[PDB]
């Protein structure tokens, strides 16, 4: 029943973290990005254009794939897990603001599914 | 004469189920509510409206007798979408993937 011996490779070494961030950019985000439903998520919600003047009152931490893409491309993240949280915030925001059953919610759910499918294959 | 039950059971439990549960199913799971979507003219341009909600209820209530009827209702749904919507529209892309899948599934239909 003897447990696994202790760690001998250190997860904080730089490439281990960069490899994960790279997978999040090149595999995960990219896959979501090329999906037919990406387009309402490719930029911050434009409250004025869509005329939703409560959005920024209701949603306190906005997030979108365009911003995540920028962070991944510009040294924002310490690690993949921070990035994963931004995705989660993006989906959660959509589910909070919109009515279950709205087109946009159904589109976020399809994205989230694909997201979770790819996250499962993150290298370690 | 003979109700084509074997073919129609296949349609309900294999074909319908698969498209019903597909990620792109939802716009097609009930008739087009033209009020809610403010498509005032929908019911003037689509003269034979058809959707999977209606196909499903029909298969479940033994509405159909011929397999070809049910298969043609699916074809009408897909065509209704292509005639009312511009090519490239999100809904047209969805209908296209659902159709390709349906075509795929229909190929293994049991025989009368």
């Amino acid at each position: 029943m003897n447990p696994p011996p202790p760690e001998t490779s250190n997860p904080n070494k730089p490439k281990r973290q960069t490899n994960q961030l790279q997978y999040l950019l090149r595999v995960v985000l990219k896959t979501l990005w090329k999906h037919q439903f990406a387009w309402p998520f490719q930029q911050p919600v434009d409250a004025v254009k869509l005329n939703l003047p409560d959005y920024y009152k209701i949603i306190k931490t906005p997030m979108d794939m365009g911003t995540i893409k920028k962070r991944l491309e510009n040294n924002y993240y310490w690690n993949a897990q921070e990035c994963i949280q931004d995705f989660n915030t993006m989906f959660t925001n959509c589910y909070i603001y919109n009515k279950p059953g709205d087109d946009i919610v159904l589109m976020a759910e399809a994205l989230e599914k694909l997201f979770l499918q790819k996250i499962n294959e993150l290298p370690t | 004469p003979k109700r084509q039950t074997n073919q129609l059971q296949y349609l309900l439990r294999v074909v319908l189920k698969t498209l019903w549960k597909h990620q792109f199913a939802w716009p097609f799971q009930q008739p087009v509510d033209a009020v809610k979507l403010n498509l005032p003219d929908y019911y003037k341009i689509i003269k034979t409206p058809m959707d999977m909600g209606t196909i499903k209820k029909r298969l479940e209530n033994n509405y159909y007798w011929n397999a070809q009827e049910c298969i043609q209702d699916f074809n009408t749904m897909f065509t209704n979408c292509y005639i009312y919507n511009k090519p490239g529209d999100d809904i047209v892309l969805m209908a296209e993937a659902l159709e390709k899948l349906f075509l795929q599934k229909i190929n293994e239909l049991p025989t009368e």
Binding site: N98, D102, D103, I104 | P27, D89, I91
Partner: peptide
């Protein structure tokens, strides 16, 4: 807000 119908 949506598929654009």
């Amino acid at each position: 807000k949506g598929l654009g119908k």
